[PDB]
Design an enzyme around this catalytic site. Structure first.
Site, PDB file in Angstrom:
ATOM      1  N   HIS A  59      26.734  -9.864 -34.003  1.00 10.06           N
ATOM      2  CA  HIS A  59      26.086  -8.560 -33.954  1.00 10.06           C
ATOM      3  C   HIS A  59      24.654  -8.695 -33.466  1.00 10.06           C
ATOM      4  O   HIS A  59      23.925  -7.710 -33.360  1.00 10.06           O
ATOM      5  CB  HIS A  59      26.143  -7.860 -35.330  1.00 10.06           C
TER       6      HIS A  59
ATOM      7  N   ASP B 209      32.165 -12.116 -37.109  1.00 10.61           N
ATOM      8  CA  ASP B 209      30.778 -11.860 -36.715  1.00 10.61           C
ATOM      9  C   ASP B 209      30.041 -13.163 -36.373  1.00 10.61           C
ATOM     10  O   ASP B 209      28.854 -13.325 -36.674  1.00 10.61           O
ATOM     11  CB  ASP B 209      30.047 -11.122 -37.841  1.00 10.61           C
TER      12      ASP B 209
ATOM     13  N   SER C 148      18.813 -12.812 -39.648  1.00 13.88           N
ATOM     14  CA  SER C 148      20.252 -13.037 -39.724  1.00 13.88           C
ATOM     15  C   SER C 148      20.643 -14.128 -38.728  1.00 13.88           C
ATOM     16  O   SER C 148      20.151 -14.148 -37.602  1.00 13.88           O
ATOM     17  CB  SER C 148      21.027 -11.740 -39.434  1.00 13.88           C
TER      18      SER C 148
ATOM     19  N   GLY D 252      15.095  -9.777 -38.912  1.00 13.38           N
ATOM     20  CA  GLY D 252      15.065 -10.741 -37.836  1.00 13.38           C
ATOM     21  C   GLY D 252      15.450 -12.127 -38.308  1.00 13.38           C
ATOM     22  O   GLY D 252      15.164 -13.110 -37.625  1.00 13.38           O
TER      23      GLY D 252
END
Ligand SMILES: [Zn+2]
Lengths: 16, 151
Positions: B29, B53, B111, B109
């Site tokens: 993502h 993901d 992940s 900021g």
């Protein structure tokens, strides 16, 4: 577009 | 001097990646199917696993790999893009709670960053902040076994 690397983290804290 | 974690940028977005077992991993993502820049031009993903993901590239120059946790603990530590280390108790396969909740902007900021066990080994990648009225109290993360199986 491409993903670029703008910095780095060293986990151990090792200095240059 | 090498780093296990790279701070990364796209035009619209900014996130982290974590090198493990020779692969440089981050969240879909964030990176989508995008390629990674290198001084020889773009490099294509080796792994794309939207179900989870998760995407991986070959480890870049200037990087070091993390060892996966065989260690078992539920005491995790999440490393942010500012190199803050945030204590997180593990609840489920892919869930953990902050010992000291934080404003969600504190996780921004970050992940794709690593959750570490007490031995500093990799437990998972930080996936998403669980918020209540702006306060992050827990986090979703991609367990490291998802990486191993993907390989
Ligand atoms: Zn461990």
């Amino acid at each position: 577009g491409s993903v670029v690397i703008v910095g780095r983290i060293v986990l151990s804290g090792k200095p240059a | 001097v090498e780093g296990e974690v790279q701070i990364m940028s796209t035009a619209t977005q900014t996130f982290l990646a974590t090198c493990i077992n020779g692969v440089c991993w981050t969240v879909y993502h964030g990176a989508g199917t995008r390629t990674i820049a290198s001084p020889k031009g773009p490099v294509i993903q080796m792994y794309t696993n939207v179900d989870q993901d998760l995407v991986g590239w070959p480890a870049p120059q200037g990087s070091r790999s993390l060892t996966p946790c065989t260690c078992g603990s539920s005491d995790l530590y999440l490393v942010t893009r500012h190199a803050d280390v945030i204590p997180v108790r593990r609840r489920g396969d892919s869930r953990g709670s902050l010992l000291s909740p934080r404003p969600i902007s504190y996780l921004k900021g970050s992940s794709g960053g690593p959750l570490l066990c007490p031995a500093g080994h990799a437990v998972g990648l930080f996936r998403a902040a669980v918020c209540t009225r702006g306060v992050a109290k827990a986090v979703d993360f991609i367990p490291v076994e998802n990486l191993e199986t993907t390989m």
